[PDB]
Structure formats: C-alpha cells, structure tokens
Symmetry: D2
Subunit: 233 residues, 4 copies
C-alpha cells in the first residue's frame, strides 16, 4: 500500500473502528485508527483554520483547529517521521462522504518545509484556486474554480453535497521531508475549510496527509477511510 501520515478532521464518529463518540481531530500513522484524538466543536457552515507543525528536534506532530472567537482543539503525538515516511514525499488534502455528506471546501492552503544539512526550503501558498491549477494533482472527485475554492468532494449545481464521494489534492513537487545527514528538519501546513451539511449528520471529514510520491486513492476508501486507507486495520 501507500505509506500515509495524516492529521484528520473527523466529522462522523465510526465507534466501530476506534473513533470517539463525537467529532474529533486525530493524528493517523499508517492507520485510520488515530494514535491520539481530541474533541472538536465543529461549527456547521463557519470557515475554520487548521495549523499542523513538526520538527526533527522535538519529533512531535501537533495540530490546532479553530474558528474565530471560539476555544481551539489541539492534538500532539511524539513520532520520528524518519522511521515512518520515505525521505521524499508528496503532501496533500483528502476528503470523503459516505451515506452522510458535507461540503469539503478548501479556501486556502500553505505549506513550508526546511532542511538544514546549507538550508533547503520549499514554500507554497494558495489563497485562491484556478480552473486549471497545474501545480496540483487532482484525484477522484476533487475540482478547482467554483468561487476560487478547492472542492475535495462532489457538489451538485445548487451547491448540495453528494454521498459516496472521495477527492484529494497533492502539491505537484516532491518534498524532501527528512535526510540522514540533516541537523534540523521542520514543516508547517495551514488550510482554511468550510464544512456545511443539510442534516445534523455531517460526514466524513478532511485530512492533511503526507505519502509516498506515487500515492493514489485506495479502492473503496469512501466514507470512514477518508480517501487515505484501503482497510480499517
């Protein structure tokens, strides 16, 4: 399979596969069964912000998700990505729907990678997305251009979300995420998102992920699997 490290914004509790009984943020290493989670007070139809950070000194992957004028949710997990990910990776955003549905709208996405061996750096910032965005690899139902936004999951003419949808956006360039002879390595990711649902049951969520360069949507990764994992193991 693909090797995946994700921060998930999980809107639908699947207690079947280890989810808590509420909307949560999670850190996923090689599995959809989060190594650490925190309660998330998801606000239907409000624009939220996700900030992910990691460095080779603390070897600690941390995420904060927040809305304006509300307490933020925060999750951290000690992990050396040197022992998990290959040296060269792609970074992306993933989303899915199942029986239940939500818009998975990305309004902005920025990423910074620094590697001191002589510092090498990569930085991109999207505050709008265009009709033909050639520095993104779009996978599944993901599209760009509607209101200058990235729609990870299928939305009908009227703006209504559809079920059984999976989409991903990967940045075109591979990223040197770690190196054997490296003194300090760090990365930071930010994205803004709008999750809107018709009912009280939004599903299934958004993830920032890091994968092998040649990563694709695994067969039947709709719903609970977030476009990231082939199975629930």
């Amino acid at each position: 399979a693909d090797t995946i490290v994700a921060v998930e914004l999980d809107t639908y509790p699947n207690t079947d596969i280890g989810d808590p009984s509420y909307p949560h943020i999670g850190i996923d290493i090689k599995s959809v069964r989060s190594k650490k989670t925190a309660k998330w007070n998801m606000q239907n139809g409000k624009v939220g912000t996700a900030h992910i950070i990691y460095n080779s000194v603390d070897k600690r992957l941390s995420a904060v998700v927040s809305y304006p004028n509300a307490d933020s949710a925060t999750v951290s997990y000690d992990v050396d990505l040197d022992n998990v990910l290959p040296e060269w990776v792609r970074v992306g955003l993933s989303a899915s729907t199942g029986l239940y549905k939500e818009t998975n709208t990305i309004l902005s996405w920025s990423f910074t990678s620094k590697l001191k061996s002589e510092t090498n750096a990569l930085h991109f910032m999207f505050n709008q997305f265009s009709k033909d965005q050639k520095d993104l690899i779009l996978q599944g139902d993901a599209t760009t251009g509607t209101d200058g936004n990235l729609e990870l999951t299928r939305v009908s003419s009227n703006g209504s979300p559809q079920g059984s949808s999976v989409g991903r956006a990967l940045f075109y360039a591979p990223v040197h995420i770690w190196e054997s002879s490296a003194v300090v390595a760090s990365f930071e990711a930010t994205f803004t998102f709008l999750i809107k649902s018709p009912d009280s049951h939004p599903a299934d969520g958004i993830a920032f992920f890091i994968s092998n360069i040649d990563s694709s949507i695994p067969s039947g990764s709709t719903g609970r699997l977030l476009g990231l994992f082939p199975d629930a193991n």
Copy 2:
C-alpha cells in the same frame, strides 16, 4: 517559448554577440534584445540575481563577483504577451569546440501573484544524488560536492565539449494571471565557471519555458540548450 537571462562566455559575432563575454536578455531568440559587457572571472564563485514585476514590466539581471563592479542588463517587456500563464523555470548550460565547467552551487526562486496572494518559493543551497523536485535533462547531474553540474565533467575533473544540460523545477509556476493587481518573480543562483586553458564556452542561462520544454535538437554550443536555430 523561451525567456532567458544568458551569461554568455563565448562571443559568436556570426549570430549577433558582442566581441566580449556578455550578459543578455533573450525573448523567443538567442539574439539578445539587450546585452552588457561581463568581466567573467575564470574559477571564481559568482552570483546572478534576476527580477521582474507586472507594475514596471521590466526584466533585470545583475551578475557579480566579490570586490568587483557588477554587470547589469534590463529590458522593458510584458511577459503577459510572451509566456503562457503556466511555465517551468530552470538553468541551462552548453559547451561546443571550447569548454568550461557549468557548476551551480545554489539556486532560489520566488513567485507571487496578488489578485483583484498566491506564492511559490524554492531554495537549494545543496543538491543531492537523487533530487526528486528537479527534472535533469541532457548531461546535467547532481551529487558531486553537493553541486549541480549542468555540463559533463570527466572522472579527472576536466570539462568536456559538445555537452548540453538543464535543470527545471518539478512544479509548474503561475507566472502571470489577467485578474492580478501585482505579479513578481526573483531568481538567484551562484555558479563556478572554470576553463582548461582559457577561451571558455559557451555559458549558463536562467530560463522560463512552456511546462513540457526539452533540449531542442542541436542546441549545443552557441544555442545554450535553449534554441533550435539562431533566428
């Protein structure tokens, strides 16, 4: 479609070169739209800085060594009317009958588009054996001393003739957009040109091309890995 800043070490007066080593701005042709005398220093590490913005619509380059007057060239051009909106950016070099090392020690690029801000930045101060965010073309290699060698160097360390190589950044770049208020880019690279007995050739270029750009047939020597012909 090519827009290049050339560091031209060999005068080819046949195709419009001045009679000295020069820096040049090339729009769609090897016959520079503007040039300036360049006091190229064999075996010293030099620096090139390229800048452009959609307000002044002026492409400028400065090339310098420590403790020496810099050489500077500028050209008014709207790149909105020249390049496609999505491009790749790279470094190119060549040798012909005459030869030089075309060593790149560092390379950075910044692009910004503010609409009515989107940004891309890369910085290489070192190059690795398997650099997956570069497309190497022709004789270009990475890993020797943590450097990018654009043209072929023998085991013994000697540069070879009839060599062409290029390095392109893997990701396409949004270089212009109609609905943009301000669009700008900046590129910097450090280079080491060393020639066996003097008489060096043929030079290094920073370029911007269509995404699918490759080394054109017979672009060794005077054509710098950039042009199919001398028109």
Copy 3:
C-alpha cells in the same frame, strides 16, 4: 528639517500647491509637490490596498492603489534613493485632516528590506494592540480601536475630527542603501479605510521614508500630510 520620500494617497485637491483637480496618488521627493501623479478613483468607506516597491537595479519607486473589482491606479518615478535619503532611515505611515476630514484607518501594514552587499528586515501587522511597543506613535495617532491604527483623531461615536495629524514609524532603523552593496530592495503593503461624512474628504495618507529622528513638522496639518514644513 527632515529628508522625506513619500507615496501620497491625496484625497483633497489643493490646485494651489500643484495638485491635479481630482483625488490622486503621488510620489513626493523632498517636497509635497508630487514629481509624478495619477488619477485615483477613491471609494468612500471601502477597504483599499496600497503596494510600494523599489530596487537599486531599476532605481524606480512604484506604487499601485486598488479596491477589489475595480481598475488599479499606478504611479512610478525613476530616482536613485542613494542620492536623496541617508543610508539609515525610519519607515512610517502619516495622515492629516484640515477644514475637511476623513477617517485615516490602517487595517494592516507590512514592510520588507533586503541589502545583499544578505541582511533583511520584515514586519507584518494584520492587527494593532492597545500598547504597540514596536511602533513610535506621533501626533494624534492611536492603536487599539477594533485592532486598527487610527492616524487621525476619531471621537467616541466614530466621527473624524479636522486639524488632525498623526504618524506611525517602525521602531527599528532600516539600512535602506549601502555604498558597497550589489542589490537593495524594499516592498511596503498597507490596507486603509477612508470614510467621510460629506463629499469633501481630506487630506490623505502617505507611506514615507525619513531620517531616523523624523517628527511632525510644525503646522503640517491639512495639505502637508504631516510630512513637510511648507508647500515649496
């Protein structure tokens, strides 16, 4: 006294001092009489953006001022700042009112300076606090109201007052040029909200560069924008 280089957003035409007959953007070298101007379609009560750029290669100071979904105004002037300003300067924003009045609200301000010879300075304000210790506030300028920088006096009710001058300078001196320097560049960006009760807004906002010890010159209210002692 002070050596001033400014980009002015001039809302009130003072044709007596060289001004065109419309709201304009201008480049001011050592004088309030703009060396180059352009018509500015100023929009009362909408948030606008100004972007100022300069580099030692082109030796050209350029400004663009725009609102969303409107054509931008642009002004440029060839000048070598090596021959005008000292090598160490302060950077700031200035605003004034006279008989006529407007809010001179700054919502954001960023500045970047690079000198290769690379030494660099960058600051970004997307909000201003009640006690902003990396700004020198001069005259009527205050911070804290809605996280904004009010360059000119505003009453409790939000109503602008006349005969007001205020400036905000960044605390640190900036190395703007150096004798043995290969490339020098700077960029400034600011967001502003100009609102007037009547059809006669005055007097405008300026991004400026001055000697480190620069202060509001006596009687630089109204047309002089808090920048100049006289109209020469």
Copy 4:
C-alpha cells in the same frame, strides 16, 4: 531585576554552581543554574551553528548546536513563556570571559516571531557594519572587525581578554506572546567562532530574551554570562 530566558553554550564547567564537568548547552529560566543541560563537544577555532525554537502549542523551548561532520548537541525544556516573560521583550546574544578567556565571535544571527490571534517580525544579519543602528551594543561588544559581532574584548593583536562582558540586542521590541493568540512561535539561528590560546576556554555565549530595558547586571562576568546578578 531583569527577567531572562536563555539558551547558554557554556565552555567552562563551574561545578560550584551546578554545571556538569564538561562543556555543555543549557536552557536557563530566571537562573544561571540550567533547568536542562546536554554534553557539548565544543571545537576550538571552528565555525559552529545554534538553532533555538519555541511554539505556544508544544510550549517547549529546544536548542541544537552543531559543527560540520559532527554529532549535534540538543536540549529541550517544557515551559509556558506566557507565565515567565512579559508580553513585550527584547532578544539578544551575550558572552563573557573571567580568569579564562575565548573569542566570542558572531558571524550571523537571524530571528523570526509569528503571532496568529498573523503578525510577524524577521531579521537576518549575515554581516555587521561599523555603525549598526538596529542593534544595541552593551559592555565590551563591538561590530565592524571582519563584518563580525565581537561580544567580548579582543586586543589589536587578535588576542581575547579576561573579565569581559558584552551583549547585542535587536533594537525593536518583540511581541513574544499574547493571551488571545491561537499559535505563537519563534526561531533564532546564529553562527559563532570560539578560539582560545590555552586548553581552558571561558566562559561562553547565550541567546536570551529579556524585558525591553534589560542591561548588564552588576558583576555578571565569567560564570554568569552577562545575564544574571548572582548564582541563585
């Protein structure tokens, strides 16, 4: 008196006041007696690099010090700087000598601060000039010799002197924390050259954060690194 948070590169073991028995890197909160230390293989006459990081999410201050082609030294400490430092601070480098001596040469220094409630401050020195107006020099600190910052006294002949203290602070105050901030982070880097004539180099270099009005405390030469009034 002054509130100090420091990363020390300590070249001289003062076991009397809690130092380990070897050259070490340390994190100092309000005291010279390091809250965490790590063995440092200090290399006389080689250019080294120091990298300091902190963010309000992990609330963990971390430092790495390295030379080319050598294993790095690393030290980390959980601390909420919200409960230690005032909201507004100055940042600097400090060094000292006592009976024993070393050059305390700074070749480069950069700092970045970001506060999302985004406000940002960034400086980079790869050169220091004769009259560097965005630095406050204190004690024996000077700039201009080889484009370097010499924190401690060096004689004409190039020889380091004992009983020397010097500091360099960035001129602008820094908003290091704010209550209603979602994420706050800072990063500092410097390159240094420590050279000693004998086998007893002393006393070391520190990156520090202090109250804005911070000065060299009375009798802070040698083991106290120009940072602390006493050894408590």
